[PDB]
Amino acid sequence: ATVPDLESDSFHVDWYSTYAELRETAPVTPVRFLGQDAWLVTGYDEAKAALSDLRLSSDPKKKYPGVEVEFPAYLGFPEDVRNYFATNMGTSDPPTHTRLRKLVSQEFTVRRVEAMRPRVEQITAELLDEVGDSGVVDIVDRFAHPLPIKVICELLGVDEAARGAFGRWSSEILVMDPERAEQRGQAAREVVNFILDLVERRRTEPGDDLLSALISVQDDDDGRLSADELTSIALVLLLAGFEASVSLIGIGTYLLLTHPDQLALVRADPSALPNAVEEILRYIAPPETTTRFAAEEVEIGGVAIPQYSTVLVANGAANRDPSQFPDPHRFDVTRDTRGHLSFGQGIHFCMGRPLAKLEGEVALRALFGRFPALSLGIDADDVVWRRSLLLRGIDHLPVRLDG
Ligand code: HEM
Ligand SMILES: Nc1cc2ccccc2c2ccccc12
Ligand SMILES: Nc1cc2ccccc2c2ccccc12
């Protein structure tokens, strides 16, 4: 048959329609992406099973005989910077993942996150106070973008002076263009340098932030975090922790604005926002696809995936599986969102889930409440989507504040 290319517009224009078509052809199909053959999983059952089957590694630095592990996400990154991006929990298999996650979960506690709420509401308040009450504004550059950035930067004790710039660095990191590869390798290097310097400043100037906390964590038999592991933990938390949240807010803002029916519900019932945040994740999952490597020949949904293959688990596609989520195309704030694969599934489940939801709820509530007549300042079908299978989102969302 025809091997679909993941670069084609079909996967970037009304893409939830092509997914559903492939999912109906074969839930597990071979594909071409970035110049490598891979397997795309677009079925719910298949995706869940895949995230649970541990023969599929999340480790890109594992060497095997006569083969080269190349996770698409690392398009362009020189080896030394790849290792810096891949020496944490999200890119490690047990037992290392096990000790890495245990040491971090010790400080990255629900307590710490709950003690943040007040500042999160304060930061949220300050931003909206600076927009005014009239005209059109880019809700991304003015709200959805800085809020998450101020939050995680405060969490990791980022020096606000020598802060910023990475915002441009991560923008470039989130798109995998086979030609801008060098620009992608250069951005990645910059990020790694900011972090290396960040921790050293932290190593020298203690504080009671999560990062200084991680620098002093220790355990009986599990041990403590080494330099490389620590610098990598900090990087992933700061990057995957702010960008993914930005998508939550922007997408979430767009969605309600275009589904007045749902906005009214959220607006009347307060207890409806926690669930509204969940349907947002389900409907347009930021982590469009997740990557695994077949360390052994695996069988997914009757299909035998050859050993040493690159498996791309399309979380976003799995969320729209009709046999698991009835009428997957109706954005419904009342729906049962239980079982969606946006925070992951299995052992690599998102550690930051409670901080993510803390932001989603606090942000959206403040926005729609202080601006009861908030409107989308552009044709809905004109909203530009980010061509990223790595992290989907909106980079410019113009809204009118007063009317
Ligand atoms: C809208 C919010 C977010 C979404 C949708 C999200 C999604 C995910 C996904 C899909 C994974 C699993 C990756 C895989 O299976 O390969 C994951 C892992 C992780 N997330 Fe998030 N995440 C979000 C926010 C955060 C935040 C705010 C932080 C931290 C500040 C964070 C930290 C982590 C960490 C440490 C992991 C790796 C855990 C592991 O692999 O054991 N996430 N997240
Ligand atoms: N929070 C996240 C952490 C990750 C850690 C390792 C690899 C991917 C992700 C990831 C991928 C898409 C969305 C969010 C995340
Ligand atoms: N921790 C992450 C590392 C990455 C490294 C290279 C490319 C993308 C990501 C990425 C993309 C989305 C979320 C997290 C990450």
- CATH no. for residue 333? 1.10.630.10
Nearest Cα to 173, choosing from 152, 191, 159, 155?
A: 191
195 CB under 6 A from ligand 3? no
Indicate which technique resolved this structure.
X-ray
Give resolution, Å, one decimal: 2.3
The phi and psi torsions of 376 (rounded to 5 degrees) equal -75, 125
In 35-153, where do the E strands start and end? 36-41, 56-57, 136-138
Return d(Cα 123, Cα 142) in angstroms, integer: 12
- Give the list of residues 6+ apart from residue 246 with CB closer than 8 angstroms, or none: 140, 144, 145, 148, 149, 393
Q: Are 345 and 47 in contact (CB under 8 A)?
A: yes
Return d(Cα 390, Cα 72) in angstroms, integer: 9
Structure tokens at 63: 């060497």
Cis peptide leading into residue 118 (ω within 30°): no
Return d(Cα 124, Cα 150) in angstroms, integer: 10
Instruction: Give distance in angstroms: CA of 352 to centre of ligand 2.
Output: 10
Q: Which of 317, 359, 363, 366 is catalytic?
A: 359
User: How many Å from the N-terminal Cα to the C-terminal Cα in the chain?
Assistant: 51
In sign, the C-alpha dihedral spanning 144, 193, 97, 311 is positive
What residue type is assigned to position 80 of the chain? D
Q: Are strands 36-41 and 310-313 parallel, antiparallel or unpaired?
A: parallel
In sign, the C-alpha dihedral spanning 281, 283, 286, 292 is positive
Q: Which domain holds residue 143?
A: 1-403
Name the β-bridge partners of 310.
293
What residue type is assigned to position 396 of the chain? H
140 CB under 6 A from ligand 2? no
Instruction: Give distance in angstroms: CA of 351 to centre of ligand 3.
Output: 15
125 catalytic residue (yes or no): no
Task: Write out the binding residues for heme.
Answer: 350
Q: Are 155 and 104 in contact (CB under 8 A)?
A: no
Chain gaps in the chain, named by the residue before each (C–N > 2.5 Å): none
Placement of tokens 């009428």 in the chain: 327
Return d(Cα 176, Cα 123) in angstroms, integer: 32
Pocket test for ligand 2, best of 88, 97, 290, 351 (most atoms within 8 A of CB): 290
- Give the list of residues 6+ apart from residue 186 with CB closer than 8 angstroms, or none: none
In 274-353, where do the E strands start and end? 290-294, 298-300, 303-305, 310-313
Structure tokens at 17: 């329609």
Mapped onto helix, strand or coil, the DSSP state of residue 259 is: coil
289 CB under 6 A from ligand 1? no
Nearest Cα to 233, choosing from 145, 105, 391, 70?
A: 105
For residue 175, with 0-12 CB atoms within 10 Å meaning exposed, 13-18 middle and 19 or more buried, which class applies?
middle
- Name the domain count of the chain: 1
Sheet of 375-376, strand order:
136-138, 398-400, 375-376
Alpha carbon 205 to chain centroid distance? 30
Mapped onto helix, strand or coil, the DSSP state of residue 394 is: strand
Residue 143 is classified by DSSP as I
Nearest Cα to 171, choosing from 247, 87, 72, 61?
A: 247
Instruction: Give distance in angstroms: CA of 5 to centre of ligand 3.
Output: 21
242 CB under 6 A from ligand 1? no
Placement of tokens 């362009």 in the chain: 76
Q: Are 124 and 253 in contact (CB under 8 A)?
A: no
Nearest Cα to 196, choosing from 206, 218, 213, 211?
A: 211
Nearest Cα to 334, choosing from 254, 285, 284, 265?
A: 265
Structure tokens at 72: 């698409």
Name the β-bridge partners of 160.
none
Residue 5 is classified by DSSP as B
Q: Are strands 56-57 and 375-376 parallel, antiparallel or unpaired?
A: unpaired
7 catalytic residue (yes or no): no
Structure tokens at 71: 């996770």
Q: Are 51 and 59 in contact (CB under 8 A)?
A: no
Structure tokens at 293: 């490597």
Task: Write out the binding residues.
Answer: 350
Return d(Cα 137, Cα 268) in angstroms, integer: 25
Nearest Cα to 290, choosing from 62, 9, 50, 35?
A: 50
The phi and psi torsions of 218 (rounded to 5 degrees) equal -150, 155
231 CB under 6 A from ligand 1? no
Return d(Cα 243, Cα 240) in angstroms, integer: 6
